[PDB]
Amino acid sequence: YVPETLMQSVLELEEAYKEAMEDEAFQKELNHYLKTYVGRETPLYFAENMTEYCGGAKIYLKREDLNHTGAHKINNTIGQALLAVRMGKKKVVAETGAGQHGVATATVCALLGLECVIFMGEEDVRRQKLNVFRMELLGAKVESVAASGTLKDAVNEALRYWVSHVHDTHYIMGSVLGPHPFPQIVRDFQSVIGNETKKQYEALEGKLPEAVVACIGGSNAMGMFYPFVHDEEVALYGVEAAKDIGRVSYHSITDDEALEAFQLLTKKEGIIPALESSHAVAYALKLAPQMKEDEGLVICLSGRGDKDVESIKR
Amino acid sequence: VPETLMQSVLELEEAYKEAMEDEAFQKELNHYLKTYVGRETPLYFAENMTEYCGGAKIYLKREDLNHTGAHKINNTIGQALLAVRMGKKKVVAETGAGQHGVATATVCALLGLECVIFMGEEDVRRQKLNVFRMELLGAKVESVAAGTLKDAVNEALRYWVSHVHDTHYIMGSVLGPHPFPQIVRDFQSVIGNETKKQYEALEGKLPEAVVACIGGGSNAMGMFYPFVHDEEVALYGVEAAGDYHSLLKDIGRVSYHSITDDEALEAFQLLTKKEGIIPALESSHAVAYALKLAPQMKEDEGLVICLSGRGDKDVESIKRYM
């Protein structure tokens, strides 16, 4: 049964995904790689100096920077790559902008023995030399898209590539920008973050956290927020640089505030956060002093501020 | 207060003994190892690497998954906590390539300790990343122009003795005076102890071989020591080519093997492509040696490689080479 159109490819993936989520063996294998390869569960760390400094709620850091790759994208890519393997596929195509999803895809393809083709707009390729080099070392073929040459164009080429090689190729999307069932699949695999956070926090405090804080970025916080979505007593704070069910209030942090948060976290907790994370920490630095001492606030940390020289130069 | 190295060391010896028998000390230590450092680290089965060599199963002890990306923190957190227990608010350390330095500054940031780190001039100028990490973490980095690791160790000793009243020396090198080699070995045994437990759980037996890097003041005794008495477990120390330590090698309990830069670079490319793990170049030497060993072992046999450090540091320098 081999698809000839994007619709048929999407339907093929729907059925495969539903079958997998009901096969206990699939989930068992996924958990095995999440444990021994990715390094889950990641710690929920009580930042006691930070807590003393703000003067309000207990502050906890969900350490997604301690995943293999140093970021949480891999939670999604490994789930999908295993799905690809389960579908009997031998290749993965993906698209990437800054490179995080690309590197994360190339990584699990190396792991699982899958060929890997990554589409990237020429503009992004020009300004992500090391990430591109990382992807190639991981064995991936990187295709520079000039058709403008932005992320949108890379996506379109990836979709066409998927369809025309669909007999053996699966498309690993990192965005929740459709089509279905890609947003669901991504949300479900990313949910291990909020699910872990919930279980770990309960075990510590015997209740749910009063607040959870994460950077929005492009959808980034779906994994952390979704498991708490039906717990309305839990305030969800999406942070962006300077769904619509009303569960998430959004906030902007400037470059300067995020710099201060970066310095404080580094000096007070010995944790060097990436720039997006620093925006999250920065908002929490505004929120924590306003909350009570017997309350708890969780900040999601992702990405490493000291991965290489180019990154720490700031 | 002590005024001599001899007295400083006796003060340390007694403080260490008491801490080690304080159940509250072991509890706190384990708390930070779990929730801060992120132990236990996983023992990962490298299936592609295993198929490639066609011999023993190859497991990777993932010390790269610690906070900081290396295993030096296992020792710094133990001694920093010891410092707090001794009632000291300051810390001095030596560092060579900077890993120990960063792990020391990290834990001083965490526990609110002042940090002075001595580092040979030649090491300072070529460890830009690690120096910036140390400074960002709030440590004073003192360049030693005397200017190798030996000169930094001596300068750290001099500083310690002079400031012994409120300063503890967190040593990472195992070539220093008693009881530092014992303390570092004990704190690092969490690597070997975990490995043995995780491997037995999986295989119902002990590894036929354990492979680990040595040098730069490091001993890999944290990984090797818990296996020393299991004589059927071969112990391999790997260096960069350029009953019951030096004893262990002399009587043949442990054997030492050198790996070239080209062999190391090859293993670095292989691990990346086969496992999606980009290793530090140092660690690659151990991977390179395991590549020579694995094919000569049986399929029903097993080998563990201690993997430490994050290779993302080295990608920039390697790209230039290629």
What are the structural domain ranges in chain B? 1-37+72-188, 38-71+189-321
Which residue in the list A58, A62, A91, A95 is annotated as catalytic?
A95
Experimental method: X-ray
Closest B-chain CA to A46: B35
DSSP state of B56: S
DSSP state of B221: H
Ramachandran quadrant class, B39 (left: phi over 0; alpha: psi -120 to 50; beta: rest)? beta
**Backbone angles phi and psi of B173, in degrees to 5:** -70, 145
CA A251 from centre of chain: 19
Half-sphere exposure (Cβ direction) of B252: Cα atoms closer than 13 Å: 2
Q: What is the DSSP string of B145-205?
A: ----HHHHHHHHHHHHHHHTTTEEE----SSSSTTHHHHHHHHHHHHHHHHHHHHHHHHSS
CA–CA separation, B36 and A43 (whole Å)? 7
Map tokens 């906030």 to a residue.
A251
Contacts of residue B213, defined as CB under 8 A and 6 or more positions apart, other chains included, come to B220, B237, B238, B239, B282, B283, B285, B286, B306, B308
SS3 B144: strand
CA–CA separation, B139 and B130 (whole Å)? 11
Which chain B residues are Cβ-neighbours of A113 within 8 angstroms? 48
Half-sphere exposure (Cβ direction) of B159: Cα atoms closer than 13 Å: 23
- Whether B272 sits inside 8 A of A110 (CB atoms) is yes
Closest A-chain CA to B310: A307
Q: Which CATH number is B38-71+189-321's, of 3.40.50.150, 3.40.50.280, 3.40.50.1100, 3.30.390.10?
A: 3.40.50.1100
Rounded to 5°, the CA angle B200-B204-B205 comes to 75
Burial of A29 (0-12, 13-18, 19+ CB in 10 A): middle
* Alpha carbon distances (Å) from B13 to B160, B181, B284: 15, 12, 36
Closest A-chain CA to B322: A133
Q: What b/e string do you get for B30-59 counting C-beta neighbours within 10 Å, with b at 16 or more?
A: eebbebbbbbbbbbbbbebbbebbebbbbb
Which chain B residues are Cβ-neighbours of A268 within 8 angstroms? 109
Q: Does B8 participate in catalysis according to the annotation? A: no
Point out residues after which chain A has a gap (C–N over 2.5 Å): 147, 218, 242
CA–CA separation, A35 and B195 (whole Å)? 15
The percent of chain B in helix, strand and coil, each rounded to the nearest 5, is 55, 20, 30
Give just the sign of the alpha carbon dihedral A23, A29, A34, A40: positive
Q: What is the DSSP string of A103-130?
A: HHHHHHHHHHT-EEEEEEEHHHHHT-HH
Contacts of residue A230, defined as CB under 8 A and 6 or more positions apart, other chains included, come to none
**In A7-128, which ranges are E strands?**
44-46, 58-63, 91-95, 115-121
Which residue in the list A58, A62, A73, A198 is annotated as catalytic?
A73
- Whether B42 sits inside 8 A of A37 (CB atoms) is yes
Q: Does B255 participate in catalysis according to the annotation? A: no
Instruction: Determine how β-strand B43-45 pairs with β-strand B57-62.
Output: antiparallel
- Whether B269 sits inside 8 A of A137 (CB atoms) is yes
CA-derived radius of gyration, chain A: 20
CA–CA separation, A252 and A245 (whole Å)? 20
In CATH terms, are A1-38+73-190 and A39-72+191-314 the same topology? yes
Q: Chain A: nearest CA to B107, how far in angstroms?
A: 6
To what resolution in angstroms was this structure determined? 2.2
Q: Does A95 participate in catalysis according to the annotation? A: yes
CATH architecture assignment, domain A39-72+191-314: 3-Layer(aba) Sandwich (3.40)
CA–CA separation, B292 and A288 (whole Å)? 55
Q: Chain A: nearest CA to B125, how far in angstroms?
A: 14
Ramachandran quadrant class, A39 (left: phi over 0; alpha: psi -120 to 50; beta: rest)? left
Helical ranges in B204-302 per DSSP H? 221-224, 246-250, 261-275, 281-293
Closest A-chain CA to B110: A269
- Structure tokens of B48? 């592609």
Which amino acid would we find at residue B286? Answer: A
Which of B202, B293, B287, B188 minimizes the C-alpha distance to A36? B202
Contacts of residue A275, defined as CB under 8 A and 6 or more positions apart, other chains included, come to A258, A262, A303, A305, A314
Q: Chain B: nearest CA to A89, how far in angstroms?
A: 18
* Alpha carbon distances (Å) from A48 to A88, A293, A296, B111, B242: 48, 12, 12, 10, 46
Beta sheet of B114-120, edge-to-edge order: B140-144, B114-120, B90-95, B167-169
Residue pair A169/A161 in contact by the 8 Å Cβ criterion:
yes
Size of interface A-B (CB pairs under 8 A): 113
CA–CA separation, B159 and B148 (whole Å)? 17
By a Cβ cutoff of 8 Å, what residues of chain A touch chain B? Answer: 35-37, 39, 42-46, 49, 63, 66, 68, 70, 106-111, 113, 129-130, 133-134, 137-139, 263, 266-272, 304, 306-310, 312
First-to-last CA distance in chain B? 56
- Structure tokens of B85? 């227990």
SS3 A142: strand
Which of B308, B315, B149, B95 minimizes the C-alpha distance to B213? B308
Q: What is the DSSP string of B120-140?
A: EHHHHHT-HHHHHHHHHTT-E
Which of A4, A1, A2, A9 minimizes the C-alpha distance to A173? A9
Residue pair B48/B275 in contact by the 8 Å Cβ criterion:
yes
Residue pair A95/A70 in contact by the 8 Å Cβ criterion:
no
The Cα diameter of chain A in Å comes to 61
CA–CA separation, B267 and B281 (whole Å)? 9
Q: For the domain covering B1-37+72-188, report its CATH number.
A: 3.40.50.1100
SS3 B317: helix
Which residue in the list B8, B63, B88, B94 is annotated as catalytic?
B94
CATH architecture assignment, domain A1-38+73-190: 3-Layer(aba) Sandwich (3.40)
